[PDB]
Amino acid sequence: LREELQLLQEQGSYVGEVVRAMDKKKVLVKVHPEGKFVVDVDKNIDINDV
């Protein structure tokens, strides 16, 4: 229960649609209400999974 309470006390994530990927772990995402962005990936996700 204490492990359940600490993980919920954490800022939420953003949802954004990937247009298409760049090279070397970079993509091209407009979120909803903003410009587009070139960001970095995490460990568990890959370029070929996009």
Of 14, 19, 45, 50, which one interacts with another protein (CB under 8 A)?
19
CA distances from 46 to 14, 33, 41, 49 (A): 19, 26, 7, 5
Q: CB nearer to another protein: give 3 or 40.
A: 40
Please identify which residue in the block is written with the tokens 């209400």. Answer: 33
48 binds another protein (CB under 8 A): yes
CA 49 to chain centre: 13
Of 23, 32, 42, 43, which one interacts with another protein (CB under 8 A)?
23
43 binds another protein (CB under 8 A): no
